[PDB]
């Protein structure tokens, strides 16, 4: 099991540099669409031999036709060729409503025009050099179609795979009572994972997928269930706020200890 | 639901929401207000601009007038302040242009490295942003004092409008007409 971390920008670099000096970081997951004009050698210098993986935040590919994506695919594919990521991955997310840009990525309506969404998945993934993995959303509200049934169709009808976020699935269980159980059929064909912390919304109305706290015990016990169910090739221990090296290192330690 | 989505872009409806739905829509809306407030300390000179209800009024106005709420949000906010107040300090205008240039470097997903922004109120100032070009280097938000675009902005930009250009890099001034 290669245990890694996410890297989206420069705010966290002091903290990552400290992690590099006090822990084994087996790989780094770049939020690659934040590095599209970055000198590739400068990226390699920072990685200092560590392998990388790609995670795409803002392709917004469900809002676009295939032709609008060509330019972004070209840049990403050059970065894929030069950096050779272990995997590449994107999100199932909603970024606009009635033409207004949202301040956050919201959950997709899985059952609405499911076939058109599967077609956009095929189109985007066919333009990227490699098998595209799609990450499960930390559901806040229930809807008619299960996220599981949605991903079952992705995995059956397209060339895409699953990037399974363990704490996102835990968040959905709390928020919408989606039994974690339902993912285990798909989990068994997944080898690349995420795990992170979260926070309570005001008045504890739902869990927010902040990547800002340490991983809590129920999520680690979910991790061990995942480890029993499948082969964990890689897991990225995510952090996007509160760049305290001791807390991130504690998360990395707990993830490794839990599967030993 | 589409009602939850509707209240995120059009918050001033009185259509009822449950507590969970209301806290979510408020949370999502709070994120864009925090971005503005954290990046523009000069707004504290006018505390009325800083209330969450003022933010909600701003977002609602953006819905009715289809103003952009992406990286151009800060520019939209300046236009709302102009629309509502008789005057706004140039330091608020400047900080909001700086915020927009910053947000451009995070949102634009092309090989172009540079955005340049100007406003009719500051015809002798050119604002810009450069994406990070090296792994450990921050994005660069800059300001130029120059008359280079002043003739173009008085002849081709109506008062109250911003104009912006996307450029491959920051070596040359914009030659063309930009947007707005």
């Amino acid at each position: 099991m290669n245990v890694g971390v996410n890297w989206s920008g420069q705010r966290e670099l002091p903290c990552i540099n400290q992690l590099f000096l006090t822990r084994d970081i087996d790989f780094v997951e770049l939020l690659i669409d934040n590095f599209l004009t970055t000198d590739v050698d400068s990226i390699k210098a920072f990685l200092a031999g560590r392998p990388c993986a790609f995670h795409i935040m803002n392709s917004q590919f469900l809002h676009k036709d295939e032709r609008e994506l060509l330019a972004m695919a070209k840049i990403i594919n050059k970065l894929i060729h030069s950096l050779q990521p272990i995997y590449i991955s994107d999100h199932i997310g909603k970024f606009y409503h009635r033409g207004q840009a949202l301040p956050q990525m919201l959950e997709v309506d899985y059952g609405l025009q499911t076939h058109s969404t599967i077609k956009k998945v095929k189109a985007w993934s066919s333009l990227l050099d490699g098998k595209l993995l799609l990450e499960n959303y930390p559901s806040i509200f229930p809807q008619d179609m299960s996220q599981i049934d949605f991903f079952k169709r992705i995995l059956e009808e397209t060339y895409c795979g699953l990037l399974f976020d363990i704490s996102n699935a835990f968040i959905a269980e709390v928020n919408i009572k989606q039994s974690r159980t339902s993912w285990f059929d798909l989990i068994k064909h997944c080898q690349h994972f995420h795990i992170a912390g979260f926070e309570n919304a005001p008045d504890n109305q739902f869990l927010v997928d902040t990547h800002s706290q340490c991983i809590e015990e129920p999520v680690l016990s979910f991790l061990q269930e995942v480890n029993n169910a499948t082969s964990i090739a890689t897991i990225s221990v995510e952090r996007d706020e509160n760049f305290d090296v001791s807390d991130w290192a504690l998360d990395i330690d707990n993830v490794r200890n839990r599967v030993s | 639901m589409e009602e939850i989505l509707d209240r995120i872009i059009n918050p001033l409806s009185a259509k009822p929401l449950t507590k969970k739905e209301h806290i979510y829509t408020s949370l999502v809306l709070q994120s864009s207000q925090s971005l503005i407030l954290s990046a523009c300390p000069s707004l504290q000179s006018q505390r009325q601009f800083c209330s969450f209800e003022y933010h909600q009024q701003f977002i609602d106005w953006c819905f009715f007038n289809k103003k952009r709420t992406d990286w151009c949000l800060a520019l939209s906010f300046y236009q709302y302040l102009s629309y509502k107040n008789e005057q706004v300090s140039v330091e608020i205008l400047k900080e909001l242009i700086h915020l927009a240039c910053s947000q451009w470097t995070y949102a634009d997903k092309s090989t172009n490295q540079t955005v340049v922004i100007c406003h009719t109120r500051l015809p002798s100032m050119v604002f810009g942003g450069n994406k990070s070009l090296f792994a450990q280097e921050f994005r660069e938000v800059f300001l130029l004092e120059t008359e280079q675009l002043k003739p173009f902005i008085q002849s081709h930009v109506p008062d109250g409008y911003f104009v912006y250009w996307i450029l491959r890099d920051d070596s040359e001034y914009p030659s063309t007409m930009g947007e707005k």
Binding site: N6, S8, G9, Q10, R11, L31, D33, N34, H55, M57, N58, H91, P103, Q104, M105, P138, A196, E199, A201, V208, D209, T210, H211, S212, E238, R239, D240, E241 | L27, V28, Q30, S31, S34, L35, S38, A39, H98, L99, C101, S102, Q103, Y106, A107, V126, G128, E140, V141, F142, L143, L144, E145, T146, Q148, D170, S171, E172, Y173
Partner: peptide, 22 residues
């Protein structure tokens, strides 16, 4: 640009991240 008389300014914001706001 050619009036290289420029000032770089700080902006207290943040890149796109997967972490939701709270």
């Amino acid at each position: 640009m050619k009036n290289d008389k420029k000032v770089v300014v700080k902006v207290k914001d943040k890149e796109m991240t997967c972490g939701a706001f709270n």
